[PDB]
Ligand binder design. Structure first.
Ligand code: MET
Length: 518
């Protein structure tokens, strides 16, 4: 089915200024979006801010300023951070937005009409910092920041409190079987697999009903009112999750402002999300609550939820590191250094180790070799002679790469996609070392044509598949190689030989990645 490829980040709480967690989550969203764009697909990538709730209102109170000002300020800081980080996100949604509120009311009303919301009580533990209902089995002993004996969340370690409120309740328990059906009929819908198994175990154990409203006093009146009952406010998570539906219905002008909210999601061909990028901290909300609401409303379910090993919500300022080491290089590091775990060091030592080893010595070095006036004397893509068996072994690696990288990108598993490309980059280097084209300029010009052509084509194809990771440096590489704009995109240009011999290199200047001291 030809739709617009719809990829989302989580919308982030605005109690705190943007930090690495949000930058990471949004980077993953950005890269997926970019890969589908290089593949020639229509893409709508979404990110934003989660502005309502007790948590934010209390953070505004601490800073001594109104919630409206506070959210607008911090939202602004987030907007600036993502511009600074050089993403290509199609739209930035805010839950304070009027059109968003409309969609929340629409969805609430649908759920109520369908018999799935009732008036009840929630009596139990609650983490305000996670905005999460917790059972007794998920709390434990700990300290508040006075240093006194309190209860804290097993999930997060944040301070929990007992809540006894009359609340609108969503009948989540009535959706246990349909959710389990969904997980089994769609075994790739939650990634990575061990997190998919975690969700399934939880839902197999049983589901309580979910409190979807809170009394307005408790939220400091900083939330969306329940339709037909202004004493209650909508649960910041139903509010929050609904951003995805809202985003799928907004028309956006060339400057990135929302101009129109369409009635039917099908008009824009975005809903449901093809990929939801989230941290492991919010898995239950996206894999249990969210599809249950969609099932109730008769709305389509997302295709994939990918949960990474970071708690999205000792300084590590990404804007600071990007200025020291390069923007693309930092993005490369974050995506290369860890797959689905915290485990993998985020040290200057290892950052330099990858910058030097992979970006400079593997990729950078190879680009200079195949473009230098020393080796490539005519400044062009030469026409190759006959291929040896060793030539063909390298060519096969280059030919097989796009299909392999495609699968990894679609999982999605961006670390594996990068490793797959660099495996081919390592191989190309080995080939160049073996063939020694610097010697071949004098000895065997006919052979050099073949060696150089293969190297150039390897560098192009690898660079194309790396262009979602290194969006700026890929443009620099393509300019040096002299690759016409039209060949920097599309599935057709994944194929070997797409740039013809005789193509002239771009003018010389420079380095791509400068090595750094240890
Ligand atoms: C609908 S995604 C909500 C994410 C949440 N605001 C967080 O910061 O974890």
């Amino acid at each position: 089915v030809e739709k617009v490829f719809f990829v989302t980040s989580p919308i982030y709480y605005v109690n705190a200024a943007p930090h690495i967690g949000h930058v990471y989550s949004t980077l993953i969203t950005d890269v997926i979006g970019r890969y589908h764009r290089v593949k020639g697909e229509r893409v709508f990538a979404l990110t934003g801010t989660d502005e309502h709730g007790q948590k934010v209102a209390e953070a505004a109170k601490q800073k001594q300023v109104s919630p409206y000002d506070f959210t607008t300020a911090v939202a602004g800081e987030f907007k600036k951070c993502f511009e600074q980080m050089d993403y290509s996100i199609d739209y930035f949604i805010r839950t304070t937005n009027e059109q968003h509120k409309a969609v929340v009311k629409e969805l609430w009303t649908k759920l109520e009409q369908k018999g799935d919301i009732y008036l009840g009580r929630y009596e139990g533990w609650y983490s305000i910092s996670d905005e999460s209902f917790l059972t007794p089995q998920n709390i434990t002993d700990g300290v508040d920041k006075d240093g006194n004996p309190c209860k804290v969340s097993l999930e997060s370690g944040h301070v929990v409190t007992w809540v006894s409120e009359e609340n609108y309740m969503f009948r989540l328990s009535a959706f246990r079987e349909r959710l389990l059906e969904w997980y089994h009929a769609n075994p790739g819908c939650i990634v990575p697999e061990f997190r998919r198994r975690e969700v399934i175990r939880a839902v197999e154990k049983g589901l309580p009903d979910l409190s979807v409203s809170r009394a307005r006093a408790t939220l400091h009146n900083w939330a969306i009112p329940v339709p037909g009952n202004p004493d209650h406010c909508v649960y910041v998570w139903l509010d929050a999750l609904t951003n995805y539906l809202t985003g799928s219905r907004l028309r956006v002008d060339e400057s990135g402002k929302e101009v129109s909210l369409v009635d039917d999601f099908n008009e824009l061909e975005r809903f449901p999300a093809d990929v939801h990028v989230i941290g492991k901290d919010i898995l239950k909300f996206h894999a249990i609550y969210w599809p249950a609401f969609l099932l109730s409303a008769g709305l389509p379910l997302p295709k994939k939820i990918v949960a990474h090993g970071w708690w999205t919500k000792n300084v590590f300022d990404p804007v600071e590191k990007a200025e020291e080491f390069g923007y693309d290089a930092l993005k490369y590091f974050l995506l290369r250094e860890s797959g689905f775990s915290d485990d993998g060091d985020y040290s200057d030592k290892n950052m330099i180790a990858r910058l030097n080893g992979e970006l400079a010595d593997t990729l950078g070095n190879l680009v200079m070799r195949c473009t230098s006036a020393k080796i490539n004397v005519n400044g062009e893509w030469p026409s190759p002679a006959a291929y040896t068996e060793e030539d063909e072994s390298l060519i096969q690696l280059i030919k097989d790469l796009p299909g392999t990288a495609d699968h990894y990108y679609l999982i999605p598993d961006i670390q594996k996609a990068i490793i797959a490309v660099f495996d081919v980059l390592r191989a190309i280097n080995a080939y160049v070392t073996d063939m020694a084209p610097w010697k071949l300029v004098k000895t065997d010009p006919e052979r050099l044509r073949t060696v150089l052509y293969i190297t150039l084509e390897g560098v192009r194809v690898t660079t194309l598949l790396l262009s979602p990771i290194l969006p700026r440096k890929s443009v620099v590489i393509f300019d040096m190689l002299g690759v016409p704009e039209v060949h920097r995109k599309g599935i057709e240009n994944f194929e070997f030989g797409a740039v013809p011999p005789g193509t002239r290199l771009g003018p010389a200047v420079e380095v791509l990645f400068s090595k750094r001291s240890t």
